[model samples]
Target chain A: TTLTARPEAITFDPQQSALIVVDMQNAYATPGGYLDLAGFDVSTTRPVIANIQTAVTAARAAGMLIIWFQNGWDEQYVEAGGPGSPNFHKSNALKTMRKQPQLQGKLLAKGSWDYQLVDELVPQPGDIVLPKPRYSGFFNTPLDSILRSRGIRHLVFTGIATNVCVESTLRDGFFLEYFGVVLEDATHQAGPKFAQKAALFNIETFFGWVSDVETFCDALSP
Target chain B: TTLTARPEAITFDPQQSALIVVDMQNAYATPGGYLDLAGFDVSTTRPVIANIQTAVTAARAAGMLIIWFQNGWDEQYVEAGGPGSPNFHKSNALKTMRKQPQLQGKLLAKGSWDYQLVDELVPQPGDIVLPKPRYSGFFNTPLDSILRSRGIRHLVFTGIATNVCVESTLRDGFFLEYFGVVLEDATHQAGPKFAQKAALFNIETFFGWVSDVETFCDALSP
Candidate 1:
């Protein structure tokens, strides 16, 4: 299948491809959740749920493997990297939890609603759902091994916070020699509107291809 | 010492820090070079050479480690990730070389003038110079081990193409638990004016701190 994308179009075989859903958890996409409770406008990320669902459905129908990424910390926050790690200082959820005594271990923590995938996009039995401690899905995860073991070379990306986790994972995938295709409308950034555009620009210019959900689905059609 | 930077002012002991200069090679920073030959305005990247030099001098005077990153593929282009790799398709230098036959094995190839560091910021004795196969200096390189061996936890970053190599390295370093500070004036990005701003914004908002050359130098003073 060939998908129309920025800079150029890309062609790949579904048998060798996977759709990676990154950090679509409640913390980033749902209202009254982590980002919303922390005063960020989750509105930007909320609407992309439908788009991601559509892409996931289409890719699944095309016999493409589906991989879901859940971002959070354990109850002990051992993976948070502690004081010397930059994640402890800069990660919004970590910082917010640090400031709000009542919210400790509630935001992006295992076994919490804030860490669960939103209702609109839950993983099926056959799908691979992996928990990631950092912003990038591939960081210290078995994601690369999983992909390589399944002979997956091309990746279709969709998730929340396009400029952060989505972009970070895609960039790392590119560095690892995997072909990356960002489903543009299937993701949204955490910052202002320009943040989304900046990520798209960076992907098209330096990282990989950027295409909207419609384009991706159309290409996947029989 | 504390350096004034975006998001927050960062304090670090000079003895525990290193100045990382990335991809300040002829291919990206000099006129009639790879980026210039490919029609990109080398003008954007050229000016930062002096700032990097100033940062290097101050870092050296303060007894900090200075590590220079030279980006290139070996003569055989084996490290370029070859045909099945995204770098083969997306990397500008690789694509440019394939398009222009005469430029093959010359642009960003080891042993070529295009791959050497520019004269203004040569690595001095006791300074470490490492060759990186990819944009992020830490990938497949001993950068992390070197930093850890020297008890270096804080990294002050400078070099060319802020949005690409510079940001990539900084992000990886941050992921590895190192504090990162990007000297805004000491580096330049690849694309439009917004590219530079976007990279700096990303660093300040998500990855690490963003400061200027003067601010860094001032903090390093006796």
Candidate 2:
């Protein structure tokens, strides 16, 4: 028997696999931001979180390419330029401009506030940070070209809005020929069970293989 | 420009349309029930009722039949004479055999409680009620035969679990050759952000064009 005659499994070379953390910012985690965990039983966060942390530590130790994708308002969505900016007084970016208690204003244009990652899932010193402006992390962004250049065969995505932004990315990524693994618990989904259910079904069958946050952390942990 | 041309303009023939209300039974409505709406708000229930009333009124005016679907449990779930004959409660079956006490122990198990609709939304005498066991309202139910026999070509779907059964029925109907239109505000989804976002997005974009409760009601008035 051949030493390499194990079951056919889809495993990528660690050097070429990029672990992507999509759109995790204080804006989503802060009290009145776009995403909050109140809808779920947050007390059970440990079970899922333990998995993610374990996976992360393993990846960092294994020399996996850790990429952090962060998003903030761009110039088009600033003060009164964006769609609903005039109505909301600002794009929520205003907080970053002035450096308030929690969020400073002016992050929309880029600065310290724009670059800061939320503490919950901060990147290690060796990680790479990429900022995107569109919903699909790949759209109009250099992510795909960069991935191609690096020969990243597998992508594990974890982030907010499982159905909206996350689904968009997963769908597009799969259609565009990338092998993607989505972490369900890692996403800060915005809707009721309907959104998550639909997103999960779509992600699981049509777009990619989906793992629960805990399961993903466990599986991906080196 | 064509007189009534628009993105969501419908070419519906009232006679060709059927209104399908899925799973608004007492199980998830009555407090303290098995699948009770423990944290769901009652106000959310109002808009859906209003939308359905509008659809029913419109359907009546247009000569469309209104069909209602409720998931129920048959005696098959439990042992009739012994402990092993217990209700084989399966959400994937024709009905959930489990009992919801506040529904007054009425719903799911094909008991008196099983047929009761939540007081929040009442079905008039002309409305035809059918029972389904699985997540798909059309599966194993005479939904298609009835619609086909009536020469129905379009379906207007509403009610609870917009993401699950409601979406499921709409998809299956599409495969079965009926045009589907879902009333957005008529479904009482559980999670505000995820549920509301999913229902609005899915109903409006793919399954059907979503109409607000008031608009749907007003459009139906004679």
Candidate 3:
């Protein structure tokens, strides 16, 4: 397969295309980071980020927009209605812990340490930063406006969990008429093999084109 | 969540459910079991089997059926498109190499050792045995009629990938009008934290009731 880019029942136009990078912030990508305890190797992901860098360079050269996405909850979590928050008290268990020392919740609330993008992969002069309240970047976020304003008809996505945020965003991208191409190699996930494989299979069969980071970056280039 | 045993909703009855222990054979549940080498924890899964055993006993007491589901593809995986027989010549190189080793050219043809159910946790007399061609147990499998024959309606499921097979079966079982409850602890997965959490959340809400085997089994008594 020279390139997995299929034009069948196409959705996006190269002229109006862009790349979206989600949640590669200080909290997730750095040493001693908020997710350091996740036990996943940041090193294994270096190549992926390197591929994203390549894709960004290509998208910039191709005159396409680049979007950086992240998620953050209000400072007063319980009051702000984020996960485990009393206000969001989506679950009874979280409601029961109204007074239990929220520990790290205090520090990483909306506009806190966990919310900032990492310094290494920081947004440059032209990168657009979008804060998502939920999993999908477009869910209740102004992502659509940003894309529509720039006439983004195609989205080449690279980021975390091919199934979670990345999958969510891709599903919306396809549904909203933006052709979705999931850069498999550019996506990172620590999930079970079967889940990972099944998602890749589904994406290949229905959602969008599936390719590796290297190939995707190459394709991103004009 | 009282035990309301309705046959039409019988398929939906968690209390009237048996643990469908799928292919937990040595090939899948032992060290270096096919998927274990792929990162599944067969060593730690013994407790899961034990939990299923507990569920089975309790389910039998509740008059629910004990169905054992397994899969063994034929010698040639060509029809099933196992590895590299030209069916998916367009498959990703990395993915192809990963998939090529075993599943090359058969869907689930008969007589392949890789498909044979392993020795440990093997199904014995009186335990219903079901085999499936695809992921869904009801897909091309005699699951429904057999359940109907036994007058079984609810399917409390517990098996691998608290995400995939368990989720797929739960979905089909529900769509087929069988009440489904996912026994959390009895199900094992190789996924990381977030994936596991997401699957559990979905199972608890849309698909079926989710609980650990201990609590679910204990509730089996009238």
Error of 3 at A14 (Å): 2.6
Best by DockQ: 1
lDDT, candidate 2, at B200: 64
- By DockQ: ranked, best first: 1, 2, 3
Candidate 3's residue-wise lDDT over A66-150, tens digit each? 7898755665544334532212322221232354455345323467666676655656678798876555686567888888898
Return the top candidate by lDDT. 1
Candidate that would win on TM-score: 1
Candidate 3 per-residue C-alpha lDDT over B1-222 given as tens digits, one digit per residue, 9 for 90 to 100: 353221111123543455677555544455644455444455677887777777777777776667877644444443334422212222232133356665443222355444455444556577788766444576557788877776666667777656555665665565455556667778776445444565665445334566666666556666
| iRMSD (1 decimal) for each model | 1.0, 13.7, 10.5
Which docking band does candidate 1 fall into? medium
Question: For each model, chain A TM-score?
Answer: 0.97, 0.71, 0.78
User: By DockQ thresholds, what CAPRI class is model 2?
Assistant: incorrect
User: How badly does each model clash, as a count of residue pairs?
Assistant: 0, 35, 26
Assess the local accuracy of residue B58 in candidate 3 as a C-alpha lDDT between 0 and 100.
79
Clashing pairs in 1: none
Off by over 4 Å in 1: none
For candidate 3, give the docking quality class from DockQ.
incorrect
* TM-score value, chain A, candidate 1: 0.97
* Docking quality (DockQ) for each candidate: 0.74, 0.05, 0.04
